[PDB]
Amino acid sequence: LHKEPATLIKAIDGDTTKLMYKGQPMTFRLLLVDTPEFNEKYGPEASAFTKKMVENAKKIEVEFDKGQRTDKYGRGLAYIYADGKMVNEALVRQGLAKVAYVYKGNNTHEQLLRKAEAQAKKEKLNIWS
Numbered sequence: 001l002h003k004e005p006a007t008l009i010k011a012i013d014g015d016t017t018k019l020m021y022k023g024q025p026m027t028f029r030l031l032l033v034d035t036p037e038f039n040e041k042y043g044p045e046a047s048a049f050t051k052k053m054v055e056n057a058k059k060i061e062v063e064f065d066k067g068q069r070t071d072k073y074g075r076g077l078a079y080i081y082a083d084g085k086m087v088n089e090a091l092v093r094q095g096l097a098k099v100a101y102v103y104k105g106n107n108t109h110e111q112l113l114r115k116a117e118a119q120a121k122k123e124k125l126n127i128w129s
């Protein structure tokens with residue numbers, strides 16, 4: 001897997017963001033995670049977490065997996081990095097997301113994220129409190 005550049009266009013919520021990728025606007029859905037919707041508990045905290053992480057990064061990168069790159073709604077499916085740090089993993093580690101939507105072929109970082117979730121659960125963080 002490799003990292004490609006992109007720039008923030010607009011925050012959306014805990015697990016979606018609007019980025020410019022190869023010069024085109026595109027909504028990205030974070031692979032392998034599920035944040036609560038804004039209207040649910042920890043939803044606002046998830047949204048703020050991602051918003052802040054992505055907007056403070058001076059460099060955003062997009063990392064596609066091996067499988068599908070677009071979902072059925074036209075969203076890009078990727079791991080997103082903020083100055084070298086993976087947002088997908090950071091959400092889980094803080095208990096602001098659950099590992100989820102694990103499909104074969106787009107699951108490279110699965111174990112890495114389950115490791116993060118196991119530690120978040122261990123600490124009773126946010127969703128696991």
Ligand SMILES: Cc1cn([C@H]2C[C@H](OP(=O)(O)O)[C@@H](COP(=O)(O)O)O2)c(=O)[nH]c1=O
Pocket residue numbers: 029030031032033034071072077100101103
């Ligand atoms: C994360 C992810 C979601 N999806 C689809 C499955 C879900 O379908 P349904 O809409 O039929 O429930 C939806 C969940 O995303 P959200 O959590 O953004 O709603 O997005 C994929 O197809 N692949 C993925 O990798």
Ligand SMILES: [Ca+2]
Pocket residue numbers: 015034035036037
């Ligand atoms: Ca969600």
